[PDB]
Ligand binder design. Structure first.
Ligand SMILES: CNC(=O)c1ccc(O[C@H]2CC[C@H](NC(=O)Nc3ccc(OC(F)(F)F)cc3)CC2)cc1
Length: 336
């Protein structure tokens, strides 16, 4: 079959929805070449969508995998509930668990892949539902411990800590949600998020201040999306009701809710312990999730495979062929 990356509305895959835990969940479904080895569920992050796995979906299909890549909660054709507790890692993990079992049955198992916020989802999903996750990998996103304590992010960065996360203050606030509405602003927003630059090298986004609205006017062609792919992101993000980015930005408004769930797990529940085979693909030039952030991550895993790729945060695409290689070979050993 054709293993080249998915094009917008590629006919090699199917585009379906299912009711999942009260929400409409849109997803990409790719059927395997040959008898199904495993079902692989891929979870994207912010500000991405299922199409963000366009390099991995046809590749994993050609390896004999069924591939389910949902548009996560708040993105594209998937519902964006008003309630913030729907956006916790626990609830979203339960969404992935019910969606995965809608294909492999309640007794079945899956391979689970995540990137950015999706990588955090799949670690938590492997933690909450070990019966389901036969193998799990995450690109860029390392494991983070069960929250033992809640502190406002303002106070954390005010003390000089977690400075690589200070962009989240703007994202969770009203500025990005109010100003990035309609396709015209979405097109500039995506040009900024995927590497576009201004006449004097102005970046449209930074990990310190977030979106630079002052710059989106002069933001140029992004090096990491072609014109067809950029228009697809705009079209799919336009499927959300205005303000279109409320759903995606809701993922940055759940620090306290996630803290309340995991402060319970830290006290009573089982520890962060991964017995199934695991892979972590770090990205060298990811300024949001730097490789050094994964320092003592190996201690939580019985079987963690480490790899690192010289790429930006957008390693699934910028280094799609290399990421495909790391996944396929690790998957080949992890499954036998
Ligand atoms: C030791 N581990 C920890 O402390 C820890 C790890 C993960 C975690 O959850 C993370 C939070 C961040 C979220 N992703 C995100 O914000 N991505 C993002 C950023 C910036 C962008 O713009 C860019 F600059 F990249 F172009 C585009 C996407 C993933 C899960 C919490 C704690």
């Amino acid at each position: 079959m054709d293993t080249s990356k998915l094009k917008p509305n590629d006919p090699r895959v199917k585009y379906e929805t299912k009711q999942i835990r009260g929400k409409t969940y849109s997803y990409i479904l790719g059927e395997p070449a040959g008898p199904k080895l495993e079902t692989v569920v891929l979870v994207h992050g912010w500000p991405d969508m299922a199409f963000g796995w366009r390099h991995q979906i046809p590749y994993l299909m050609s390896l004999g995998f069924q591939v389910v890549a949902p548009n996560m909660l708040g993105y594209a054709g998937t519902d964006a509930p008003r309630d913030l507790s729907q956006f916790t890692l626990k609830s979203v993990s339960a969404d992935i668990a019910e969606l995965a079992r809608s294909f492999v049955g309640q007794d079945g198992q899956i391979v689970l892949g995540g990137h950015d916020w999706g990588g955090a989802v799949v670690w938590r999903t492997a933690y909450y539902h070990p019966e389901l996750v036969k193998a799990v990998f995450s690109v860029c996103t390392p494991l983070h411990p069960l929250s033992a304590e809640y502190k406002p992010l303002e106070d954390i960065v005010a003390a000089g800590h977690m400075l690589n996360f200070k962009y989240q203050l703007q994202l969770k606030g009203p500025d990005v949600e109010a100003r990035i509405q309609g396709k015209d602003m979405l097109r500039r927003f995506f040009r900024a998020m995927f590497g576009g630059r201004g006449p004097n090298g102005e970046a449209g986004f930074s990990t310190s201040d977030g979106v630079h609205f002052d710059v989106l006017d002069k933001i140029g062609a992004p090096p990491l999306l072609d014109e067809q792919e950029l228009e697809y992101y705009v079209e799919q993000y336009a499927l959300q009701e205005a303000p279109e980015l409320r759903g995606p930005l809701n993922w940055y408004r759940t620090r306290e809710l996630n803290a309340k769930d995991e402060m319970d797990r830290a006290k009573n529940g089982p520890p962060l312990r991964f017995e199934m085979p695991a892979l972590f693909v770090a990205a060298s030039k990811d300024n949001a999730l730097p490789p050094a952030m994964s320092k003592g991550m190996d201690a939580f895993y019985k079987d963690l495979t480490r790899a690192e790729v010289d790429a930006t945060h957008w390693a699934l695409t910028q280094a799609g062929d290399e990421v495909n290689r790391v996944i396929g070979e690790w998957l080949n050993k992890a499954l036998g």
